[PDB]
């Protein structure tokens, strides 16, 4: 049968097989295990004629020790034997036969970890290296018995490295062992026992072999590097016994610094730098202070390091230079707190000043590195994080320990820092990137770099303030005309890039501010006659750009994006000084008019046109959000312009329609100085426009994709209008409304103009059409419109505030006709908004009504086997428990439906369903909004279903994974916190249904009470998984 076994093994690994590889691999899984599966691996490895894939399948079939106590010895013996065969055949050869050896090594690692494990056979296998290495010195099977835990002389260890492949195999074997132990540690937390036997036999010989490779010429083998990292990663996960590595680090430093261009082409240099970068980025304290200071001297300095960097830049080895930069920054970022201390606080008077100021000078000098960013060097890129951490350290220092020159020196340093970074993030850099690489990932990295620098500038504001940062940017930008020509096109590319980067960082600094707490912004802009002119000229220059190339197109987008966001953030300034706003508004709408009447159809210049258009409209809406009172003179004009573009036959975009309606609504919202009637006139005009456009579209054409998109646009316009008319929650100067509050409260409560009825009759006409009610997008926007007025501050005279009935009628009119699986979440979220709004008026009868009509009648044919909707229903019940628990406790479906159904969903296999039902039961147990009667009844009810419940929990943990264990703990723990007496009454009956260790947890889960479960739980799950 072995020949046919080999046949379908080969057929498994064939490029064009028949007989279905799925069934082939299933049949191969059937062979292992079996009566002969072990013997099959035997005969598969011992026969020379079998191919490499076939021998490796044999080695794999030996791995089935997971399928009583002495067959383990049989498999161990076979691993050692076939190991020795295939490793003797290795030296007198060249290549191809190493992966089967690696597999045998991995399985010997698993054996190593099974024998040296708790829970008269044999208990010891101390040094697999010694065991391995005595088996080339070789009545026959009797050898393996004594060779097992046999000691090896360090001289005979070195004799084995007579050839190079012997050294390779010896290093690879320890590598494999610790790599598999690392894999086992990541998955499983029951090896604190074997880390000591590894510490006590394998560690010593491994360190000996590695150190011999590092110190002895003619025996060195680069595999040692792959070995070292392994043993580093293994030691890092144990604890950050103590395994040293300090001498290995010393010899790696020495071997690195012996690597030059003439010695070996810096190969060992880059290898040891990868090793040190691993150490520095993941566990840097693993290297002691003395060795770190040797590293510091080497990295910072004819000096070695410099001669390496030049080697990288002349040969254009920019990727290796990048990874070098990453390593150096991770190193420098170890001692940021001590550098911050040794600089700015006083806790060798100045011969350590002579050292650390030179340190800072060469760090600044390295940051400025004379190559273009991201395209050539990441030195400036990678340690924006260093300077960020250093500035955070400085700002967080104790105020009573700073040196007297701390402010001045920090200002000097962190101001030369921005002097460095501003040219680095110039759009000229991005221009060159796309000129030499196109729209690659280097531009994404460049955007990440500018955002990192912007965060750095925000951080530096707290050190530099406005005097030494923001005022510098505004003054340098506002004292000279960037384009004195009244065309306002910045004619010189260099001044254009410079002023754009300045706008970028100025924007970033200005967003952290609320430009109303201080007259600073008005005072500084009043001192700079050319500031607004230069902002507007940046906008015009970018937006009148003749986009000849795609480079120019993407740069045009960048310039207009910077300028527009800067205008939107200067909105607050505009409110303090409104007579400067009119040029911005005129420029924005002139550019919008340019966008719209632009009809040239390259089809890929119109996407850029629409991007420009949406930027423009976003910023006019952000200006209207803050300057709504100052923009009143434009209102009548806006409404007119809206009328000429609200039509479908316009080259405007739907998003700009919506944002234009929102900005108009912002301006209308503050028109309260007269009565409510004059404002309602504007609102009525807008609602009539929008609803009539919707109805005209619905009645004039068949609803193809164009008409559907237009209906969607108009529904979002209604939503934007509703949002813009919400009163701002923050108190504003001269409310005027506050004198008229009552007469608005009386006006919109009556709504003589029937705004609410018009709007929802429009929504109904949309969603009474079969084409749309099945569309979750339009269901969503309708529910949002109906829910704007819900949960607003009490007494707010909001125009579109629907009462409870009006809302449910809506959902009641449209859930029977929608596509449930996609649309019902929006209706349910609206009902949750409803029950939050009307929580004090609601009765359990009304809760049952809306729970029956909306959820229960659809539960079996639509919800029970749909994880999203099921999580939805669970969240609905949880929300009612958060808000008013008596609605669910007093429900006629509480014991009937909710408790039994949520009881069955506990052993769900979808993680968010698990966490939802766990949240449900935990809050049921721990809800603090209970009165005492509700608490008594809830304890009665949970005591009734407690056995079934604790069964469903334990049933879940039996089959679920480690990631979703915690979601059960919080649940289970809750029980023992509140029902500790029933708990074990419930545990002793459900645990045998799904022995000693079980009782163990029963004695140690209840003993803990709470907070430190899970740790008690997984040690149970790790027990009851193996069996």
């Amino acid at each position: 049968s072995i020949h046919e076994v080999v046949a379908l093994i080969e057929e498994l690994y064939s490029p064009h097989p028949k007989h279905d590889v799925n069934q082939i691999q299933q049949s191969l899984q059937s062979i292992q295990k079996s009566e002969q599966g072990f013997h099959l691996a035997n005969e598969l490895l011992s026969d020379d004629k079998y191919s490499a894939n076939v021998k490796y399948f044999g080695a794999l079939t030996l791995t089935v020790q997971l399928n009583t106590l002495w067959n383990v010895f049989r498999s161990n013996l076979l691993y050692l034997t076939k190991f020795s065969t295939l490793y003797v055949s290795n030296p007198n050869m060249y290549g191809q036969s190493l992966i089967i050896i690696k597999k045998l090594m991995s399985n010997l690692s698993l054996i190593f970890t099974k024998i040296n494990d708790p829970q008269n056979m044999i208990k010891q296998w101390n040094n697999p290296i010694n065991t391995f290495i005595q088996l080339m010195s070789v009545a026959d099977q009797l050898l393996l018995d004594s060779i097992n835990c046999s000691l090896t002389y360090e001289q005979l260890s070195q004799f084995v490295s007579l050839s190079q492949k012997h050294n390779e195999l010896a290093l690879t074997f320890t590598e494999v062992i610790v790599e598999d132990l690392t894999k086992f540690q990541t998955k499983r937390h029951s090896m604190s026992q074997i880390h000591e036997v590894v510490h006590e036999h394998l560690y010593i010989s491994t360190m000996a072999l590695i150190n011999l490779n590092l110190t002895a010429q003619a025996v060195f083998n680069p595999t040692v590097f792959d070995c070292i990292t392994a043993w580093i990663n293994y030691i890092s996960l144990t604890r950050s016994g103590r395994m040293d590595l300090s001498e290995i680090f010393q010899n790696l430093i020495d071997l690195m610094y012996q690597s030059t261009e003439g010695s070996d082409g810096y190969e060992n240099a880059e290898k040891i730098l990868t090793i040190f970068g691993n150490v520095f980025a993941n566990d840097p304290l693993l290297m002691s202070y003395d060795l770190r200071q040797q590293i510091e001297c080497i990295f910072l300095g004819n000096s070695w390091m410099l001669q390496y960097m030049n080697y990288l830049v002349t040969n254009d080895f920019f990727s290796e230079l990048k990874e070098l930069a990453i390593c150096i920054v991770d190193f420098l970022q170890i001692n940021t707190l001590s550098v911050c201390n040794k600089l700015f606080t006083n806790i060798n008077g100045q011969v350590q000043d002579e050292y650390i100021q030179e340190y800072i000078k060469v760090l600044l000098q390295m940051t400025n590195f004379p190559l273009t960013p991201v395209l050539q060097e990441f030195f400036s890129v990678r340690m924006v994080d260093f300077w960020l951490d250093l500035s955070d350290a400085y700002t967080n220092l104790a105020s009573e320990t700073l040196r007297p020159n701390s402010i001045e020196l920090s200002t000097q340093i962190f101001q030369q820092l921005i002097n460095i970074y501003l040219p680095k993030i110039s759009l000229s850099v991005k221009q060159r990137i796309i000129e030499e690489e196109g729209e690659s990932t280097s531009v994404n990295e460049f955007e990440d770099f500018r955002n990192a620098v912007s965060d750095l500038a925000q951080s530096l504001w707290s050190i530099l303030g406005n005097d030494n940062l923001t005022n510098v940017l505004i003054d340098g930008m506002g004292q000279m005309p960037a384009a004195s020509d009244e065309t306002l096109i910045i004619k010189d590319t260099d001044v254009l890039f410079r002023i754009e980067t300045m706008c970028f960082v100025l924007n970033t600094i200005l967003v952290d501010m609320t430009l109303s707490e201080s007259p600073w912004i008005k005072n500084i802009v009043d001192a700079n006659k050319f500031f607004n002119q230069n902002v507007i000229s940046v906008f015009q220059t970018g937006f009148q750009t003749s986009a000849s190339t795609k480079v120019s197109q993407i740069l045009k987008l960048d310039f207009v994006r910077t300028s527009t966001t800067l205008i939107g953030t200067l909105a607050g300034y505009f409110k303090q000084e409104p007579f400067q706003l009119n040029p911005y508004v005129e420029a924005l709408f002139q550019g919008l008019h340019t966008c719209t009447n632009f009809t040239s159809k390259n089809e890929q210049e119109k996407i850029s046109n629409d991007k420009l258009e949406v930027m423009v409209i976003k910023t006019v809406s952000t200006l209207c959000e803050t300057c709504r009172e100052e923009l009143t003179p434009y209102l009548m004009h806006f409404i007119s312009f809206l009328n000429t573009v609200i039509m479908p036959d316009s080259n405007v975009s739907h998003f700009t329609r919506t944002k234009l309606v929102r900005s108009i609504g912002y301006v209308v919202q503050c028109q309260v100085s007269n009565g409510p009637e004059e404002q309602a006139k504007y609102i009525l005009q807008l609602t009539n426009l929008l609803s009539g456009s919707i109805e005209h579209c619905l009645a004039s054409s068949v609803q193809l994709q164009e008409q559907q998109d237009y209906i969607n646009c108009l529904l979002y316009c209604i939503s934007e209008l509703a949002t813009s008319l919400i009163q701002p929650t923050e108190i504003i100067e001269n409310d005027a409304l506050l004198q008229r509050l009552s007469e608005f409260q009386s006006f919109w409560s009556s709504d003589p103009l029937q705004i609410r009825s018009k709007i929802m009759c429009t929504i109904d006409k949309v969603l009474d059409n079969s084409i749309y009610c099945k569309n979750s997008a339009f269901v969503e926007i309708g529910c949002l419109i109906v829910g704007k007025g819900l949960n607003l501050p009490d007494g707010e005279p909001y125009f579109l505030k629907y009462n409870m009935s009006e809302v449910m009628n809506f959902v009641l009119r449209h859930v029977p006709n929608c596509e449930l699986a996609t649309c019902l979440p929006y209706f349910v979220y609206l009902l949750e908004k409803l029950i939050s709004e009307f929580r004090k008026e609601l009765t359990p009868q009304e809760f049952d009504f809306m729970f029956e009509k909306i959820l229960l009648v659809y539960y079996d044919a639509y919800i029970i086997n749909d994880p999203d909707l099921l999580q939805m229903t669970i969240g609905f019940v949880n929300n009612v428990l958060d808000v008013k628990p008596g609605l669910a406790i007093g429900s006629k479906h509480w014991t009937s439906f909710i408790l039994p159904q949520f009881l069955k969903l506990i052993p769900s296999r979808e993680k968010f369903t698990i966490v939802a039902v766990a949240k449900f039961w935990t809050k049921l147990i721990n809800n603090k909004k209970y009165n005492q009667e509700e608490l008594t009844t809830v304890r009665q009810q949970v005591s009734s279903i407690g056995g079934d419940l604790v069964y469903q929990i334990m049933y879940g943990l039996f089959h679920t994974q480690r990631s979703d264990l915690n979601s059960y703990t919080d649940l289970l723990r809750a029980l023992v916190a509140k029902f500790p007496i029933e708990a074990r009454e419930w545990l002793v009956a459900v645990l045998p249904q799904i022995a000693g260790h079980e009782k163990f947890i029963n004695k140690l889960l209840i003993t803990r009470g709470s907070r430190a479960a899970g740790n008690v739980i997984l040690q149970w799950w790790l027990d009851c998984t193996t069996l």
Binding site: Q29, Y56, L60, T186, R909
Partner: protein, 171 residues
């Protein structure tokens, strides 16, 4: 046409089966039934230089269901490692899968995919990922529910497996 063996590995969950099912039929599976061993499925992509098909070996992430495990990696020509950005423990096992792959196929191209980006309670940020050091290894944020970076890991693979950074997958 030309054919390439892909092996799809990663911890249980994370969404390997739903990933290949969205690529194969456009369906999105909401429920989680763990795979038993492997499932092999052909995925043909159309592009210049004719079509190319990846036969995808969707492996089981749960070791209890591992099946042949390492045996599926033999004769593999490319690999995709996948983790769940909402479950950080899946990201911590990535080097485990990586060494399990390269210990039998070391110089093959491997794409690392952070699935489920659509869930905005994301617990793994792109700056944390550092496994884009080498050239035979690439990272992508993908979402089998959102089609975000839908067929990009297959594009990068294809490009390296045939040897041209310009294919773009025409429809």
């Amino acid at each position: 046409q030309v054919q390439f063996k892909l092996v799809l590995v990663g911890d249980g969950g994370t969404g390997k089966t739903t990933f290949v099912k969205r690529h194969l039929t456009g369906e999105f599976e909401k429920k989680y039934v763990a795979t038993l061993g492997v499932e092999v499925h052909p995925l043909v992509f159309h592009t210049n230089r004719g079509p190319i098909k990846f036969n995808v070996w969707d492996t089981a992430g749960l070791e209890k269901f591992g099946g042949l495990r390492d045996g599926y990696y033999i004769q593999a020509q490319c690999a995709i490692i996948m983790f769940d950005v909402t479950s950080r423990v899946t990201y911590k096992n990535v080097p485990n899968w990586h060494r399990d792959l390269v210990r039998v196929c070391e110089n093959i191209p491997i794409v690392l995919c952070g699935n489920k980006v659509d869930i905005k309670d994301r617990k793994v940020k792109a700056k944390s990922i550092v496994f884009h050091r080498k050239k035979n290894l690439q990272y992508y944020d993908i979402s089998a529910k959102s089609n975000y970076n839908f067929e990009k890991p297959f594009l990068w693979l294809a490009r390296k497996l045939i040897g041209d950074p310009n294919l773009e997958f025409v429809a």
